[PDB]
Structures are given as C-alpha cells and as structure tokens.
C-alpha cells in the first residue's frame, strides 16, 4: 500500500514515456506481485498513449526522407557512402522502434499483444516496421551497379583535359585512369558486408580490386604530382631547363 502511494508519486512527476519507464524499471521485484500490477493497470492505458507518441515522433523523423535529414549531410562528412548511409539511418530507427516495443512488454507484461490497446499499437508498429525495410534499397543498388559495369580497365593512365586560367589552350594534366564513383563502390561493398546484405560476388570483385588498386593508384599520382610539381620549378626558372 505504501508502494501504491509511491506509484502515485512517481507518475505525477513523469510526463514522457521514457521517464515513466525508468522509474517503472526500478520496480523489478514487484512484477511477481499482482497488487502493484493492478496499480500499474491504473496507469497502463496512459503509457500506451505515451509510447504511441514516441513511435509517432519516430515516424515523424522517418517522414523526412534520408537525403533531407541532417544525417545524410553529416554522413557525407564521415566518409559514409549514400546508399549505405540511407540503410544505416533506417536501421537505427527500426531498432529504436523495437526498443519502444520491448518497454511495452515490460509495462504491459507478457501477453500484452492480446490487449485491445496492445493490438492497436502493435498494428501501428508493424506498419511502420514494414516501411523501414532496408532490403529494398540494397537490391536496387546491386542492379544499378551491374548496369553501370564498373571496372578501372582501359590503361594505367588515361589523360584528361583541363582548362587552366591564363592559358588559351586546354592544359592536359596527367591523371591516374580512374573514376570518382569507383571510390564509392569500395566503401559501399565494405559497408554492406558488415550490415549483413549479401553483395553480388561480381560487385565484390570490382570493389576490392579497386581498393587493392588504390595504394598503387595513389602511389602513381604522387609520381604525377611530384613530376608536375617539379615542372613548375623548371617553368619558374628557364635557365635550368
């Protein structure tokens, strides 16, 4: 009965769903007694409404698409390629949805889903969970990558043209035969394997080889850069030419 008074005391302070769970988390010994469970049943109908708001707010975060979200901007900062970034951003939301559902099982006890309130919230969580599938994103990338057919190939060097200020003719700068997207596939495949998606073995080959070619590729552009950087010294002083 004293705890029942405390059960009045603790909830009146807490308005957020998370807040009630913490104080509720403390009462670990009293889940055996069906006296406090009734006093929990006094509050139960409120807590489904509270966690519904968190899942609503979690859904609101999902309403803003990943590219719009701040996560995409700062994932780009943190050498996280886009397709993996969208997957990771979705995966965390699904986990935090699952985290809220576990609290409900703690709040409402085992067999909570049988509750009329439990059926409704479970239906709401399931629909949001379906929307958070990350297999759909990975599969499209595998198709699109195979359409692109990435491979360095060609030559070790494939020169390209650049317009330089102060020179009327285009200045050809030696470049390692390479494409910017080839960086991403090395990071995408590396990310996806950890995430758990089974990358196609073909794309696996194209990505690691570029990764294994990257040390030699950057080793060569040093020689290009150094040979370049040496040349402007010669351009500076025509005497030593």
């Amino acid at each position: 009965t004293r705890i029942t008074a405390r059960l009045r005391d603790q909830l009146g302070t807490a308005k957020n769903a998370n807040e009630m769970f913490r104080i509720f988390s403390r009462f670990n010994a009293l889940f055996v007694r069906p006296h406090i469970r009734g006093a929990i049943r006094e509050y139960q109908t409120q807590l489904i409404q509270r966690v519904k708001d968190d899942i609503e707010s979690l859904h609101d975060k999902f309403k803003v698409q990943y590219p719009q979200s701040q996560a995409c901007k700062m994932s780009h900062v943190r050498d996280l390629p886009p397709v993996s970034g969208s997957i990771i951003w979705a995966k965390q939301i699904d986990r935090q949805l699952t985290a809220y559902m576990k609290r409900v099982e703690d709040v409402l006890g085992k067999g909570w889903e049988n509750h009329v309130e439990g059926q409704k919230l479970k239906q709401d969580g399931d629909s949001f969970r379906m929307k958070l599938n990350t297999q759909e994103i990975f599969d499209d990338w595998a198709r699109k990558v195979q359409q692109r057919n990435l491979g360095v190939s060609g030559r070790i060097f494939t020169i390209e043209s650049t317009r330089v200020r102060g020179r009327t003719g285009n200045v050809l700068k030696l470049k390692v035969n390479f494409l910017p997207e080839i960086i991403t596939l090395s990071k995408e495949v590396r990310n996806l394997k950890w995430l758990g998606f089974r990358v196609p073995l073909a794309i696996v080959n194209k990505a690691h080889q570029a990764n294994q070619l990257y040390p030699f590729a950057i080793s060569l552009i040093e020689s290009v850069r150094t040979y370049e950087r040496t040349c402007e010294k010669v351009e500076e002083r025509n005497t030593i030419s």
Partner: peptide, 21 residues
C-alpha cells in the same frame, strides 16, 4: 641543343598517338 619536350607538346604528341588507336 637537346631540350626536354614541354608538357603541352609531349601531351599533344600522346594525344595524337591515343587518337589514332
């Protein structure tokens, strides 16, 4: 007087070589 080919002239030579291939 042997002089190193300029970057532009040597690269135009390499352009000519690549283009015909």
């Amino acid at each position: 007087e042997l002089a190193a080919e300029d970057e532009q002239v040597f690269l135009m030579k390499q352009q000519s070589l690549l283009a015909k291939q």
